[PDB]
Design a protein around this ligand. Structure first.
Ligand SMILES: [Ba+2]
Ligand SMILES: [Ba+2]
Ligand SMILES: [Ba+2]
Ligand SMILES: [Ba+2]
Ligand SMILES: [Ba+2]
Ligand SMILES: [Ba+2]
Ligand SMILES: [Ba+2]
Ligand SMILES: [Ba+2]
Ligand SMILES: [Ba+2]
Ligand SMILES: [Ba+2]
Ligand SMILES: [Ba+2]
Ligand SMILES: [Ba+2]
Ligand SMILES: [Ba+2]
Ligand SMILES: [Ba+2]
Ligand SMILES: [Ba+2]
Ligand SMILES: [Ba+2]
Ligand SMILES: [Ba+2]
Ligand SMILES: [Ba+2]
Ligand SMILES: [Cl-]
Ligand SMILES: [Cl-]
Ligand SMILES: [Cl-]
Ligand SMILES: [Cl-]
Ligand SMILES: [Cl-]
Ligand SMILES: [Cl-]
Ligand SMILES: [Mn+2]
Ligand SMILES: [Mn+2]
Ligand SMILES: [Mn+2]
Ligand SMILES: [Mn+2]
Ligand SMILES: [Mn+2]
Ligand SMILES: [Mn+2]
Lengths: 201, 201, 191, 191, 201, 201
């Protein structure tokens, strides 16, 4: 059958032990658990809210079979805990989808939840799953350049500060400016020398 | 088998979900999708136009196997969505080939489509994937040198400014000067120190 | 073909010279040898630390020639050193969960000054995490050079997870980037 | 397994599509194609310039898929580009010495803006020769920066074998070393 | 087969020209030649000492094949000079083993020879071929840091001087500090800038 | 049979065309030809000088058989030109041996000739055959350090100058200092900064 690392599935509060949150920790795999979903618009007649459930993002350590994860949770939480496991094609999406903040979920105007009710098991960090491919770097690098040139930023700090305010405007966060100007260090020096000399005239 | 970043393949409107354009977005990979191909001269007897189809240009983030992308789309859009995935040798061509405006496609006098019906998923920008073959770089580098020497440009800025005006004259745009002087950083420093010392006398 | 520093493999008392423990020493590479495994045929687990990235098969041969072609038939690349080492006494997480026979830490044979504390580096994704931290730090407290940063570390290290030899391991190669940060701070302190 | 930029191979008119000349263009790599060789079976010699170091077999496949598996069966790595190019018209030194039939330079098919003048670099041992020269020069005439050196080159280039784009090709990567030389000269001019 | 830099092999006085010691010099490779081995305990019945022989430690300049060195010596000294060439895994050991002072040789209580009868051809210096395994470097590097920090050494010289006096205390000799701070150049600059700024306050 | 790149052999003025020096050039291989040997002490009774001859150092472009070179010269210069071809084990030696300035030739107190009468065919340069193996570099590097430290040389020039005078004392020539401090650029900077600061106090 098929194998993969990224899975997702549903957990209903009614069908799971009261210590599930700890029982899942025991698997030693990283997971992300949605805030509780208790506000999903039910197209069912005479009912506003779908039964309450949790979405679980589950990250095997090695390529395995969907059914291997099915069993592993049935044994952990009882056979009535889950009945449907799916392979995650894109992790970033399925994760935003936890709070209905993914592109598909906003376009279907679904109820938005709170990022803070998200339960991170086993040091799960979404970023250790979001890579910034080559071409994306150099794009932004040129941006950082247009920026340092435009606003005559004279050092790594002034740039950082500028980012702190207008970050979202150009798509930039601090740890991204750090990831971007990685290794381009020398080039950066050139840009600040430039700006600094220019501010002088 | 083989691994690579650049792929292409075919999508038939009849075999794909009505939300495919969004489903592909979910993969978080950049793609370029042809205008609809509904005008391809069919050498089949009794038929003017090949079945209607879409060409998809697909840019993995990391070298992967053709079959890995086959599966990924079969699961996304249904096993009847594609049956043939190919490795793209030249991105620039296979992209022009989307509107039958590539050299091969003009020489086979194939129906030309409209550039504007091209669907760009995930901030795909063709300019990202065309890059200066080696010899091209060093040519221009020598140019940037003739330039910094000739006009006594004393820093990355003055050079940039000069480029802003006389760019086309020498073939240079800003993001090209950036692509060119990549890694030659050190060498650049030498040139500016030169110019700056020289302006002083 | 793959190259790496960390390997492991099996040695059977029946198939090895009676002076193997010394013969391995001769390779001048650091190794850790399990207590004898006789409670799982009796065998030894060997943790082997090349000095330079090499091929699994290069180590296969090197031991076949050293101890005889019947000494080992399977060499593996070690992904995590800390684990594969605990696994020597079946005290690794995987080995406790499979309730395997636990051995004695003291029967472990350390060849060529092998010290487990040594081969613990930061996996990639860990370095850059901390690097960003060192940045948030140098930015926040306007540290103007490698020293002021060091000092700051000396006091509030544990707060941010940093020790001196970690700051050193972290800012490895990021040298240039660091220069940018101090120039920054120093200019900023001036205004 | 070996990687390189420069390859050559054979194409037989009998085994290739009638649009091959265009099909090769599609690869977006620069090539030089011999006039037809029918005076030595009739064949074409192809000079092929990968954009990045790759494996001979990677190019084998790439052409088998492009032109059909019967198009080529032998791909070779080009050691010297200038020669293998002259060898297209049997005007290379080896080909004149074996008195082989000479063809016409004009029947040569240049795909994708291939220009022979482009792929002539300095072999290793040649660079460092000249580098030492640039050093003897910067030392001798106390040139105090990349400019003064450039200027000097502009006048006495031919004397030492140097042109500007060669000084650029030479001092490639030796950047740092160059800095040392100018600091030197500049300090020395001061005394 | 295999390529490597470090080899060893045997030379019998009976089978070699009387000018061998000079003939080997001619190869322009560094070698170390054992004192004469004429005292090796022979397990052969009726004989105390193995035939007399020399051990040769041979250091190619570039990775080559064992057989390439076999030939090279057969041609130099005659085909009856050597019949067995081996790749040296550890140079430091195989060198001590020249005087039977290696760990293996002491444990097998073999006859110990004199260090002074060792013939060094072509400026062979054992210290050249013993080198700090990775972890060893970085240990000492941190030391050099603790040092430059502790005593506020403001440049490569002051550090050097300090080493000249208190070397042994920290395990450091000059050519070791040089071997250690190899490539860490940049990092070193940071440390001196630090110290120097700090001395100012 | 055996194959190799480096050969040597003898040419007698009496047995060779008067245009030999040009005929050899025609082979397009690099060679080095001794000054004329007309002063070799003949152990023959009643004769001071061996018949006059030339030594030829010959560098095939590809591994070939000694006999292949035998023929190639017999056809070029006539079958009476040479009767003995040998494989060169060490090029540097066999070349010094051209003027009897090799170690073996000095030890046999043989007549020394003039380096300038050496005939270099086809751009033969002995150095393109003399490599400086790793350990040799770093040895000398430490030397350059002991030197820059000792004499407080404050820049690449002062070092160069010092080399010009005391070169041979430490084994150093200019193009060797250049080959040595290759890539160690940064480290060098450290040394000059050091010296320069130190001269100030
Ligand atoms: Ba219940
Ligand atoms: Ba309702
Ligand atoms: Ba990341
Ligand atoms: Ba992304
Ligand atoms: Ba903010
Ligand atoms: Ba349908
Ligand atoms: Ba571009
Ligand atoms: Ba404009
Ligand atoms: Ba050791
Ligand atoms: Ba092009
Ligand atoms: Ba004898
Ligand atoms: Ba040493
Ligand atoms: Ba002392
Ligand atoms: Ba005659
Ligand atoms: Ba006599
Ligand atoms: Ba050389
Ligand atoms: Ba040498
Ligand atoms: Ba002199
Ligand atoms: Cl960096
Ligand atoms: Cl760069
Ligand atoms: Cl570093
Ligand atoms: Cl460069
Ligand atoms: Cl260095
Ligand atoms: Cl350099
Ligand atoms: Mn939901
Ligand atoms: Mn089509
Ligand atoms: Mn076991
Ligand atoms: Mn031909
Ligand atoms: Mn012995
Ligand atoms: Mn002679």
């Amino acid at each position: 059958k098929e194998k993969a690392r990224y899975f997702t599935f549903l957990l209903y509060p009614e069908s799971i032990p009261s210590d599930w949150e700890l029982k899942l920790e025991t698997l030693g795999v990283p997971m992300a658990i949605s805030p509780l979903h208790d506000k999903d618009k039910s197209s069912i007649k005479g009912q506003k809210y779908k039964k309450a459930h949790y979405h679980v993002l589950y990250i095997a350590k090695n390529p395995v079979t969907a059914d291997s994860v099915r069993k592993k949770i049935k044994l952990l939480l009882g056979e009535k805990s889950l009945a449907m496991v799916q392979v995650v094609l894109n992790v970033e999406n399925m994760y935003l989808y936890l709070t209905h903040e993914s592109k598909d979920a906003i376009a279907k105007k679904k109820h938005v939840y709170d990022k803070a009710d998200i339960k991170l098991i086993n040091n799960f960090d979404i970023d250790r799953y979001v890579t910034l491919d080559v071409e994306e770097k150099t794009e932004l690098f040129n941006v950082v350049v247009s920026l340092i040139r435009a606003y005559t930023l004279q050092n790594i700090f002034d740039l950082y500060d500028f980012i702190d305010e207008n970050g979202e405007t150009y798509g930039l966060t601090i740890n991204l400016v750090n990831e971007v100007i990685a290794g381009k260090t020398g080039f950066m020096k050139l840009l600040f020398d430039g700006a600094y000399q220019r501010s002088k005239r």
